[PDB]
Amino acid sequence: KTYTLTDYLKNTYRLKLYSLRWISDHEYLYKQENNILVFNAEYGNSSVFLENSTFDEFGHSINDYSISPDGQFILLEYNYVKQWRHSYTASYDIYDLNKRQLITEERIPNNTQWVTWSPVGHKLAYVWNNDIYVKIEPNLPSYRITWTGKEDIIYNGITDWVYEEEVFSAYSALWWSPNGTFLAYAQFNDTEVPLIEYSFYSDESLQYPKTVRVPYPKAGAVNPTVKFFVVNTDSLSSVTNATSIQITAPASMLIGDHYLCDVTWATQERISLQWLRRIQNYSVMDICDYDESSGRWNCLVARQHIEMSTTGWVGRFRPSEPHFTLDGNSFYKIISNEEGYRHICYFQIDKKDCTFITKGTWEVIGIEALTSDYLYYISNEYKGMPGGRNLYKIQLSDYTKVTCLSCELNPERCQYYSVSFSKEAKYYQLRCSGPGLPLYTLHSSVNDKGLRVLEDNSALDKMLQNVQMPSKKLDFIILNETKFWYQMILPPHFDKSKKYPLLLDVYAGPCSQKADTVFRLNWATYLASTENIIVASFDGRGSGYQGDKIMHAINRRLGTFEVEDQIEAARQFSKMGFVDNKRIAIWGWSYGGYVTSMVLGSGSGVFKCGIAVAPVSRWEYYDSVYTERYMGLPTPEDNLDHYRNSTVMSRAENFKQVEYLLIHGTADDNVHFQQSAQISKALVDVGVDFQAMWYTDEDHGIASSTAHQHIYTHMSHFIKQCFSLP
Amino acid sequence: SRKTYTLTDYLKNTYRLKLYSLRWISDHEYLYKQENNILVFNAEYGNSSVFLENSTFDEFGHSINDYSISPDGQFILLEYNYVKQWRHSYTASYDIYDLNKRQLITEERIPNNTQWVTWSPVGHKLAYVWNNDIYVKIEPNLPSYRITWTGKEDIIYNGITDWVYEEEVFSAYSALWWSPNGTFLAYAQFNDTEVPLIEYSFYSDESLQYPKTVRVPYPKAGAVNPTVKFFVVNTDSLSSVTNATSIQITAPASMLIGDHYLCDVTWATQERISLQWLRRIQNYSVMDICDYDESSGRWNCLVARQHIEMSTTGWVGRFRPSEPHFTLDGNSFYKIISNEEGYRHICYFQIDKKDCTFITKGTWEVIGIEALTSDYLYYISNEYKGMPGGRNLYKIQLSDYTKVTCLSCELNPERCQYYSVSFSKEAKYYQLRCSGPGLPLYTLHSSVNDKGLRVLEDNSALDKMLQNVQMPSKKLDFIILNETKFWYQMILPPHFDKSKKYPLLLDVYAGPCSQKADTVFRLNWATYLASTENIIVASFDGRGSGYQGDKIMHAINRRLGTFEVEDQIEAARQFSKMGFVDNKRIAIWGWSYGGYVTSMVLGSGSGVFKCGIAVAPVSRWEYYDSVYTERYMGLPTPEDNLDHYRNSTVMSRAENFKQVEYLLIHGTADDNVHFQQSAQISKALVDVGVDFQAMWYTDEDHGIASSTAHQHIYTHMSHFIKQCFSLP
Ligand SMILES: N[C@@H](CC(=O)N1CCNC(=O)C1)Cc1cc(F)c(F)cc1F
Ligand SMILES: N[C@@H](CC(=O)N1CCNC(=O)C1)Cc1cc(F)c(F)cc1F
Ligand SMILES: N[C@@H](CC(=O)N1CCNC(=O)C1)Cc1cc(F)c(F)cc1F
Ligand SMILES: N[C@@H](CC(=O)N1CCNC(=O)C1)Cc1cc(F)c(F)cc1F
């Protein structure tokens, strides 16, 4: 017996997580049963913070809780209703922990788009109907900060579609000052933004299908406009209306279309803003500090920090995030150095010259902590493996004494790490995502001492001993003397003598990584375990975490090098003796579906069959912020001619050599069903047969319990059929 | 004949069938296109001149889609820039050409985007519809007259039918009715103001960045229907200052009490017109006969001249009340109505005498009246050999109803037992269109003596190229179920033998008053499946089929999805026990209603069919338009038939699709049976975890008639069949 498709679809062998919430510098909450505990990191003992019966007679079902920073109130989230990738709307009830009652007077309105606490205390701000309301106390009436909230037009406190999906990766457009004082927010105006219209069929009893309409700026279309505002909460008036001071953009940004990409608070009176231009290769860092005189926010032109690029676009997916020191006069920002590798640089608010404190043929992933004596960061520097992750601590007084805190803990089963720090970076938890079963340990920062193991997945590990689990080989091949990485989910009892069918699991998106040391139980696990299928992934040009030399290779050339490298990789995978070159499939989702489609039409005879789920077909169809970031603008004076060259429809004739399976969701707000609609029509006009499958009222995720089981049961047969498997 | 009829020969259309589509310009001559040239043939002796050459508009600069000669012959209407809309509707650009001058008319040209145009029955009076407003053009080069002034897109339809009256009622985009002399122009006005709108996406060429949303006034079962008013105008008394006064003919009080339709408009004489009205509950029609008052200029409809036609066992008519055929004086008319025995035969009526007297009778039905003279009435009926799938032309003397003489039964009973006819102006001659069972044959006859003059087209060229082909044979027979004779047909593969077991495909439609079993000769996908893949394509006509009486047609009345589904399973069970039919390989495929039956049959869990293909199927009858659905289902209300509306959905059988292999196909731009229906089908199958094959067609409507899409769907369905039947 092996890892079956039923196991994957039903979550038979479930990984164990350790979700903890640092409430202080030495205490973190943990989800035990349904009770809430409060662990003392120093001693490992806990004490019950809330029984699982406090909400026994509640009447609804909490989806997520939110204790106030001080610990005097707890916000309850129920009636969850999902919207886009990150956005959602739900209901909220405030619980007075001290009174041990439930707030009934002046309750948060239902259908609230976003809510969040202030960093300290119990001050509360939430967005409802596209407008910002702040409640100094849970029982006090809320103050209306904005009055221009308007559905599908004016977004105050929340991001619109493109900003949520392509920039902030969150529905929240609010930013609290370090302490409960100021509230910064953005205002998005989608008045002149075109609308995407697709049909929604709803439940069986919906006689006339509803037509969904979303402000969706496509490639080169009219983009939404952004305004930034800051308002003081400790001065709100119940008589007159609160005044919000608007922070404008530098002239280098106002000269044309632009975006807002980052908002980070330096000190209690200093706030950092980063602006991006339509043609996203020139960033600007405006540092604003409060003025007690005029009550305005002045941004010293003497404090800017220009960040441009020449080989490609600025930032991986956006300009990096600044990490200001405790005093707000020096920060750390991950940027790509001279040779093209992203490393931690050290800035001065007054000096426009940053000083890199790290360097090498690798990249710093993120900056996780900044104390007085040590800066903490994640990077793929260990053993020159980009697909690996470890935590290094660097001394601020010596840019040479760098210590790794995770490379050597358990190098056998731990090469991909994550960390969560306490409030004052006195302790930290380490997540070991792979290559072995996940591991959760607690550490004390004083001497980087290891305290205990919080979770080791020993319960799960006991089960896999009887099932035939697949092995995962991570290695590299050579393209034009450059070293590119790949991974192979090898079936159980792998024999290099027998010929195996190879399935190429591909994404190939800008700054992507499908080859890593991460342990995961997915559809590829069943394919190799039960069907004895070598499912592999490859990181060609465009893949990130390896320098701008590789990533920026596809700048303005989307659907070219990243497509060729995949073909080239499978070309060399087909000569390994254990790979039946006559049965090499490929499949991809989202961007991967676009590459898969661009591959099956390449006319190379390398691949026999393929599957493309929710693929892009024409870059003019996708949203602007993402598309234009890499392609430019669809104009004959910019890069229109490559927009027209990279369409998968213009490559239909060559689909006669391969079996194709096109799958898409009829409610895909992200990669509109229009994309696959144009693909099928192009194949029809050249007499190319293919398989297809639409999923009614499904989005880009196709995450419905029934839909998810259906699409993977459907693709599995297509693969078994193609490889001639029982 | 070592070669067989393949799918390429069908898709690429190798063996093409010829016709002889003429146009009677009078009682003596007709027009027929020869070799890009329009000719004029003399029915008496077969001589011919040339009415227009290929090198006449050769330099016109427009790919002419169609022409339109005038009754007299002084002008010819040219139709170019054709733009299809729905089934019968479209908008094209028009140009007039003066035959007596050989010059294109340019003064006050007919506007572009014109929705409908047509001359007067005699002369050269012209009336067209532009922006939903009627225009009258007395002379082809003089200014037009603004008849109606309420034209409004998707709201007010003047002179044209909306979507519902175009598909289910008149089967035409035209809402104009000239009087014989052309003096009066009768028209109807539709109002879809309160009608809901169906909204689906249109994707267009690659270059369209944002998908367009198509919105169409479409009344689903239960929703409010469009409202209709009727008007008449005197095309002579055209003021052009005060324009025109549109006299309105009000509907009968029996109809105005509630929702109702306008189902038929037939002119009796130069001053008498008959209007048939239909109620929401399609079982009570009322014909109104109105005369033009020469003193007040009004239109009164005497109650004595008003005729009631109702039905108790179902809906009245096959799809709508029959059209009346009035006499010369316009005081009596012969109309097709259902007998007291349940069969549809011709009845003789009088203007002011309600009790009609049938001139025909028997266990057969009259398909339709083709021509009416002062002494004989020519009609088509499935009487000969008692075959419901046959069509022959009959001639009955109006002074003696025993003088029943068939004109086509005996011409060639071998290759012809299904006839279509086209008479002259006064029926001096008539063309016979034998569609089957042999190769189509076109002939011309003279009614004065009823003798064959000359053969128009015997498709001898087609017969010459089928020599080197292994054609399938077609058998027409019947089985018996509960003392009733139900008919079926099979397309047997060439060299048929009972010593083998054949895969059998059940081609189905099974709609109300339908008939998939007949004698017609066809070259289609079924011919390829039988000729090449050796598949027995069979069809069955039982319970709900027309032309067999009301007791069979009105059986599924207010009960769709039970009798049609049950008989197809019963017939398939019958055919599976004949001997030469294999049990392991039996399928079923249907288009439109046939797709609804195909899905219902597979969802029945009867366990008979290995696979099944449904193309543009109906899901629930709440999704389809009102007039068609409510004609067979009543209203979807608790006090009517809502309970059956819900127990007849195909989604409620998603659980039973685990046994059968399913293939769902539907066009994205389908405005008749919306893609919404198939979307709900797949969603139901997904919610119960049953795998199936699916295929959408971008921008394709309910026809899937595109050149590239037609070949693609049948190529995909051929693979689905060949793999389900394990055929090499
Ligand atoms: N960009 C996403 C990649 C993705 O969607 N995949 C990759 C693998 N195959 C798929 O089909 C789906 C991941 C991602 C999205 C965010 F919004 C974000 F904030 C952070 C993230 F890491
Ligand atoms: N829009 C993209 C957002 C993204 O990639 N990231 C990277 C991780 N960090 C982020 O902030 C967000 C994802 C995406 C790309 C496609 F090409 C596509 F077809 C569909 C998609 F969903
Ligand atoms: N109702 C239509 C049913 C049909 O023939 N089918 C359905 C499936 N696809 C086909 O090609 C065959 C035919 C039809 C006949 C008339 F006489 C008429 F006036 C209007 C019509 F629409
Ligand atoms: N709407 C129907 C019109 C019709 O059948 N006729 C019969 C021949 N004479 C006429 O006047 C029109 C056709 C139809 C029925 C369905 F159930 C369906 F799903 C789709 C369809 F197109």
Secondary structure of B213-262 in HEC code, one letter for each residue: EEEEECCECCCCCCEEEEEEEECCCCCCCCCCCCEEECCCHHHHCCCEEE
Reported in sequence order, the residue ranges of B342-471 that DSSP labels E, i.e. its strands, are: 344-350, 353-358, 366-372, 376-381, 392-397, 400-406, 416-423, 429-437, 441-446, 451-457
The residue of A644, A660, A693, A697 whose CB has the most chain B CBs within 10 angstroms, and thus the best one to mutate to test that interface, is: A693
Distance from C-alpha of A308 to C-alpha of A315, rounded to nearest angstrom: 9
Distances in Å between the alpha carbon of A253 and those of A249, A250, A445, B227, B249? 6, 5, 42, 58, 69
Distance from C-alpha of A394 to C-alpha of A391, rounded to nearest angstrom: 10
HSE value, Cβ hemisphere, 13 Å, CA-based, for A163: 26
Looking at residue A166, the DSSP 8-state letter turns out to be: I
Question: What order do you get walking across the sheet with A330-336 strand by strand?
Answer: A323-324, A330-336, A342-348, A351-356
Distance from C-alpha of A70 to C-alpha of A73, rounded to nearest angstrom: 8
Distance from C-alpha of A264 to C-alpha of A287, rounded to nearest angstrom: 10
User: Is there a contact between A2 and A702 (Cβ–Cβ < 8 Å)?
Assistant: no
Distance from C-alpha of B359 to C-alpha of B371, rounded to nearest angstrom: 15
Distance from C-alpha of A620 to C-alpha of A628, rounded to nearest angstrom: 9
Q: Do B211 and A692 touch (CB under 8 A)?
A: no
Question: How many helices (H) and strands (E) in chain A?
Answer: 12, 44
Domain identity same for B23 and B35? yes
Domain identity same for B652 and B667? yes
HSE value, Cβ hemisphere, 13 Å, CA-based, for B311: 28
> Experimentally, how was this structure solved?
X-ray
Reported in sequence order, the residue ranges of B574-719 that DSSP labels E, i.e. its strands, are: 581-591, 611-615, 661-667, 693-697
Which of A457, A488, A521 is the C-terminal boundary of a domain? A457
Q: Do you know the residue count of chain B?
A: 728
Distances in Å between the alpha carbon of A229 and those of A163, A176, A182, A277, A321? 17, 12, 10, 19, 20
Residues of B whose CB is below 8 A from A689: 712, 715-716, 719
User: Is there a contact between B527 and B472 (Cβ–Cβ < 8 Å)?
Assistant: yes
HSE value, Cβ hemisphere, 13 Å, CA-based, for B506: 37
Using a 6 Å cutoff on CB, does residue B171 contact ligand 3?
yes
Cα–chain center distance at A7: 27
Q: Which two structure tokens, joined as six digits, stand for A387? A: 């697909």
Amino acid found at A505: D
Distances in Å between the alpha carbon of B692 and those of A312, A719, B613, B682? 45, 15, 10, 8
B340 CB-contact burial (10 Å; exposed 0-12 / middle 13-18 / buried 19+)? exposed
Residues of A whose CB is below 8 A from B220: 207-208
Distance from C-alpha of B283 to C-alpha of B632, rounded to nearest angstrom: 10
Hunting for tokens 């490393």 — which residue is that?
A343
Domain identity same for A182 and A278? yes
Distance from C-alpha of A41 to C-alpha of A327, rounded to nearest angstrom: 28
Domain identity same for B435 and B554? no
User: Is there a contact between A199 and A209 (Cβ–Cβ < 8 Å)?
Assistant: yes
Distance from C-alpha of B293 to C-alpha of A641, rounded to nearest angstrom: 71
Domain identity same for B333 and B360? yes
List the one residue out of A447, A266, A449 whose CA is nearest residue A374: A447
Q: Which two structure tokens, joined as six digits, stand for A420? A: 């969560």
Residues 205-244 in A contacting B (C-alpha not used; CB under 8 Å)? 207-209, 211, 218-219, 221
Angle at B323 between CA B322 and CA B328, to 5 degrees: 140
Looking at residue A648, the DSSP 8-state letter turns out to be: S
Residues 20-59 in B contacting A (C-alpha not used; CB under 8 Å)? none
List the one residue out of A621, A201, A155 whose CA is nearest residue B686: A201
User: Is there a contact between B506 and B538 (Cβ–Cβ < 8 Å)?
Assistant: yes
Provide the b/e sequence for B554-571 (b: ≥16 CB within 10 Å): bbbbbebbbbbbbbbbbb
User: Is there a contact between A211 and A197 (Cβ–Cβ < 8 Å)?
Assistant: yes
B723-727 contacts at long range (C-beta below 8 A, 24 or more positions apart): B724/B585, B724/B587, B724/B610, B724/B611, B724/B661, B725/B503, B725/B533, B725/B535, B725/B585, B725/B587, B725/B610, B726/B585, B727/B503, B727/B533, B727/B534, B727/B535
Looking at residue A468, the DSSP 8-state letter turns out to be: B
Distances in Å between the alpha carbon of B720 and those of A303, A496, A630? 69, 38, 42
Distances in Å between the alpha carbon of A324 and those of A182, A332, A375, B67, B302? 18, 6, 11, 80, 95
Looking at residue B705, the DSSP 8-state letter turns out to be: -
Distance from C-alpha of B175 to C-alpha of B166, rounded to nearest angstrom: 9
Distance from C-alpha of B287 to C-alpha of A342, rounded to nearest angstrom: 86
Return the SS3 of A254. Answer: helix
Cis peptide before B494 (omega within 30 of 0): no
Q: Do A196 and B210 touch (CB under 8 A)?
A: yes
The CATH number linked to B205 is 2.140.10.30
Q: Max CA-CA distance within chain B? A: 83
Distance from C-alpha of B551 to C-alpha of B342, rounded to nearest angstrom: 6
Domain identity same for B394 and B529? no
List the one residue out of A502, A661, A653 whose CA is nearest residue A573: A502
Distance from C-alpha of A203 to C-alpha of B644, rounded to nearest angstrom: 19
Distance from C-alpha of B78 to C-alpha of B318, rounded to nearest angstrom: 36
Domain identity same for A124 and A179? yes
Residue B679 at interface with chain A, using a CB cutoff of 8 Å: yes
Output helix, strand, coil percentages for chain B, rounded to the nearest 5: 15, 40, 45
User: Is there a contact between B589 and B613 (Cβ–Cβ < 8 Å)?
Assistant: yes
User: Is there a contact between A703 and A689 (Cβ–Cβ < 8 Å)?
Assistant: no
Q: Which two structure tokens, joined as six digits, stand for B386? A: 């008692």
Which of B459, B493, B516 is the C-terminal boundary of a domain? B459
Distance from C-alpha of A357 to C-alpha of A367, rounded to nearest angstrom: 13
Return the sign of the alpha-carbon dihedral for residues B313, B318, B321, B324.
negative
- The shortest CB-CB distance from A204 to any of B199, B651, B708 is to B651
Which of B439, B459, B479 is the C-terminal boundary of a domain? B459
**Is the backbone of residue A315 left (phi > 0), alpha (psi -120 to 50) or beta?**
left
Domain identity same for B539 and B514? yes
Hunting for tokens 């008589």 — which residue is that?
A239
Distances in Å between the alpha carbon of B206 and those of A647, A664, A679, B166? 9, 18, 9, 31
Distance from C-alpha of B426 to C-alpha of B436, rounded to nearest angstrom: 27
- Domains held by chain B: number: 2
Reported in sequence order, the residue ranges of B467-579 that DSSP labels E, i.e. its strands, are: 473-481, 484-492, 502-508, 536-541
Task: Residue A638: give the domain boundaries.
Answer: 1-11+466-726
Q: Do B682 and A696 touch (CB under 8 A)?
A: yes
User: Is there a contact between B132 and B160 (Cβ–Cβ < 8 Å)?
Assistant: yes
Residues of A whose CB is below 8 A from B203: 674, 677-678, 681
User: Is there a contact between B590 and B615 (Cβ–Cβ < 8 Å)?
Assistant: yes
Q: Do you know the residue count of chain A?
A: 726
Angle at A548 between CA A543 and CA A549, to 5 degrees: 90
Resolution (A): 3.0
Helices (H), B302-374: none
Residue A194 at interface with chain B, using a CB cutoff of 8 Å: yes
Distances in Å between the alpha carbon of A516 and those of A20, A435, A513, A547? 25, 8, 7, 16
Domain identity same for A521 and A649? yes
Residue B691 at interface with chain A, using a CB cutoff of 8 Å: yes
φ, ψ dihedrals at A531, nearest 5°:
-90, 0
Secondary structure of B474-506 in HEC code, one letter for each residue: EEEEEEEECCEEEEEEEEECCCCCCCCCEEEEE
Helices (H), A220-342: 251-254
What angle in degrees, to the nearest 10, is found between the helix axes of B593-603 and B563-576?
70
Residues of B whose CB is below 8 A from A195: 210
Secondary structure of A541-598 in HEC code, one letter for each residue: CCCCCCCHHHHHHHCCCCCCHHHHHHHHHHHHHCCCCCEEEEEEEEEEECHHHHHHHH
CB atoms within 10 A of CB B318: 20
φ, ψ dihedrals at B54, nearest 5°:
-65, -30
Look at strands B284-292 and B260-267 and give their pairing.
unpaired
Return the sign of the alpha-carbon dihedral for residues B152, B155, B158, B164.
positive
DSSP string, A103-125: --TTPPPSSBSEEEE-SSSS-EE
Domain identity same for B554 and B571? yes
Distance from C-alpha of B651 to C-alpha of B179, rounded to nearest angstrom: 50
User: Is there a contact between A132 and A121 (Cβ–Cβ < 8 Å)?
Assistant: no
Among candidate residues A516, A668, A669, A697, the one labeled active-site is A668
Q: Which residues pair with B239 in a beta bridge?
A: none
**H or E element at residue B680:** helix B675-687
Distance from C-alpha of B161 to C-alpha of B337, rounded to nearest angstrom: 26
Domain identity same for A420 and A480? no
Spatial neighbors of A101 by CB under 8 A, at least 6 apart, are: A95
Q: Max CA-CA distance within chain A? A: 83
Spatial neighbors of B72 by CB under 8 A, at least 6 apart, are: B122, B123, B124
Closest-CA distance, B442 to chain A, in angstroms, reads 36
Amino acid found at A702: I
A644 CB-contact burial (10 Å; exposed 0-12 / middle 13-18 / buried 19+)? middle
The CATH number linked to A638 is 3.40.50.1820
Using a 6 Å cutoff on CB, does residue B592 contact ligand 4?
yes
Distance from C-alpha of B673 to C-alpha of B590, rounded to nearest angstrom: 14
Domain identity same for B140 and B258? yes
Pocket test for ligand 2, best of A670, A672, A674 (most atoms within 8 A of CB): A670
What angle in degrees, to the nearest 10, is found between the helix axes of B675-687 and A705-723?
90
- The shortest CB-CB distance from A677 to any of B222, B622, B668 is to B668
Return the sign of the alpha-carbon dihedral for residues B163, B167, B173, B174.
negative
List the one residue out of A480, A518, A479 whose CA is nearest residue A380: A518
